[PDB]
Scaffold this motif. Structure first.
Motif, PDB file in Angstrom:
ATOM      1  N   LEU A  57       0.751  -1.265   0.000  1.00  0.00           N
ATOM      2  CA  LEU A  57       0.000   0.000   0.000  1.00  0.00           C
ATOM      3  C   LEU A  57       0.789   1.330   0.000  1.00  0.00           C
ATOM      4  O   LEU A  57       0.429   2.242  -0.752  1.00  0.00           O
ATOM      5  CB  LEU A  57      -0.998   0.016   1.168  1.00  0.00           C
ATOM      6  CG  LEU A  57      -2.182  -0.959   1.130  1.00  0.00           C
ATOM      7  CD1 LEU A  57      -2.773  -1.103   2.519  1.00  0.00           C
ATOM      8  CD2 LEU A  57      -3.273  -0.514   0.174  1.00  0.00           C
ATOM      9  N   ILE A  58       1.825   1.466   0.835  1.00  0.00           N
ATOM     10  CA  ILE A  58       2.628   2.713   0.865  1.00  0.00           C
ATOM     11  C   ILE A  58       3.518   2.834  -0.354  1.00  0.00           C
ATOM     12  O   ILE A  58       3.515   3.864  -1.038  1.00  0.00           O
ATOM     13  CB  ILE A  58       3.548   2.824   2.101  1.00  0.00           C
ATOM     14  CG1 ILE A  58       2.729   2.943   3.388  1.00  0.00           C
ATOM     15  CG2 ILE A  58       4.478   4.024   1.954  1.00  0.00           C
ATOM     16  CD1 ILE A  58       3.505   2.572   4.637  1.00  0.00           C
ATOM     17  N   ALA A 107       2.341   1.173  -3.646  1.00  0.00           N
ATOM     18  CA  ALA A 107       1.336   1.842  -4.461  1.00  0.00           C
ATOM     19  C   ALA A 107       1.181   3.350  -4.280  1.00  0.00           C
ATOM     20  O   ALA A 107       1.199   4.097  -5.260  1.00  0.00           O
ATOM     21  CB  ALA A 107       0.006   1.141  -4.296  1.00  0.00           C
ATOM     22  N   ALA A 108       1.017   3.794  -3.037  1.00  0.00           N
ATOM     23  CA  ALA A 108       0.737   5.200  -2.758  1.00  0.00           C
ATOM     24  C   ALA A 108       1.830   6.146  -3.256  1.00  0.00           C
ATOM     25  O   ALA A 108       1.506   7.151  -3.890  1.00  0.00           O
ATOM     26  CB  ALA A 108       0.483   5.402  -1.297  1.00  0.00           C
ATOM     27  N   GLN A 109       3.102   5.817  -2.986  1.00  0.00           N
ATOM     28  CA  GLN A 109       4.270   6.566  -3.509  1.00  0.00           C
ATOM     29  C   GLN A 109       4.404   6.451  -5.009  1.00  0.00           C
ATOM     30  O   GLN A 109       4.403   7.451  -5.720  1.00  0.00           O
ATOM     31  CB  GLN A 109       5.588   6.074  -2.892  1.00  0.00           C
ATOM     32  CG  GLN A 109       6.179   6.953  -1.767  1.00  0.00           C
ATOM     33  CD  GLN A 109       7.025   6.149  -0.733  1.00  0.00           C
ATOM     34  OE1 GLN A 109       7.533   5.059  -1.022  1.00  0.00           O
ATOM     35  NE2 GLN A 109       7.173   6.703   0.471  1.00  0.00           N
TER      36      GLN A 109
END
Lengths: 197, 35
Positions: free
Chosen positions: B20-21, B23-25
């Motif tokens: 998730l972090i 993906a997010a970045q």
């Protein structure tokens, strides 16, 4: 899509929220062994863990709904306000999570003080690390509050699309920082469990 | 051995969260291509 991103941000917060409960479970076990009741801070901790868990549950719940609503409007292309609301949401969720980190950190600090030397086996670094990440996240929250307020006005007039994008970054970095914080509380508990269990 | 399959859950939420972090970045660094 900022909307999809916000979904990952939400989702991340949830995982962190479970991770967090795992540490509360962790600290509760140790607390039982090392401690003679809610005396000296502990029933309040206990009560405040709950008062914050419940507020955060409710915040994830409002976010999940803003999310579905945002998603249903991706083809109506006017929904600046929904995205900005979702950002407000995530900010509110991050802070409550912070309060919760702060309680667990305090928990561990109490427990460690009774059974280990805080100058041994990695605990000096731990203090500093804890303390830095705390100040880092506080700063990112402060900046996020500041950014929210601004966006909310930029949204009246012509575009303030850059500030939404900026804010996403803000929230994104506060979550990475809570994630470190989390790792550090896992480390601490792992040390205490090793020593006393 | 509750503490090892606790230690299971944390290391394996911790390894959801990173990717998730992930993906997010790797969305954030699409976002800076508006900026």
């Amino acid at each position: 899509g900022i909307v999809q991103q916000q979904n990952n941000l939400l989702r991340a917060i949830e995982a962190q929220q479970h991770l967090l409960q795992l540490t509360v479970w962790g600290i509760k076990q140790l607390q039982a062994r090392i401690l003679s009741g809610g005396s000296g801070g502990w029933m309040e901790w206990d009560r405040e863990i709950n008062n914050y868990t419940s507020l955060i549950h409710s915040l994830i719940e409002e976010s999940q709904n803003q999310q579905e609503k945002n998603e249903q409007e991706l083809l109506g292309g006017s929904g600046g306000s929904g995205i900005v609301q979702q950002q407000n949401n995530l900010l509110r969720a991050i802070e409550a999570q912070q309060h919760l980190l702060q309680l667990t950190v305090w928990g561990i600090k109490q427990l460690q003080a009774r059974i280990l030397s805080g100058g041994s086996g990695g605990w000096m670094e731990w203090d500093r690390e804890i303390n830095n990440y705390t100040s880092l996240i506080h700063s990112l929250i402060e900046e996020s509050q500041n950014q929210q307020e601004k966006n909310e006005q930029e949204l009246l007039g012509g575009s303030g699309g850059s500030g939404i994008v900026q804010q996403q970054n803000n929230l994104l970095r506060a979550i990475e920082a809570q994630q470190h914080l989390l790792q550090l509380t896992v480390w601490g508990i792992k040390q205490l469990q090793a020593r006393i269990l | 051995x509750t503490w090892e399959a606790w230690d299971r859950a944390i290391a394996e939420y911790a390894a959801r969260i990173e990717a998730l972090i992930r993906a997010a970045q790797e969305q954030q660094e699409k976002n800076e291509a508006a900026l």
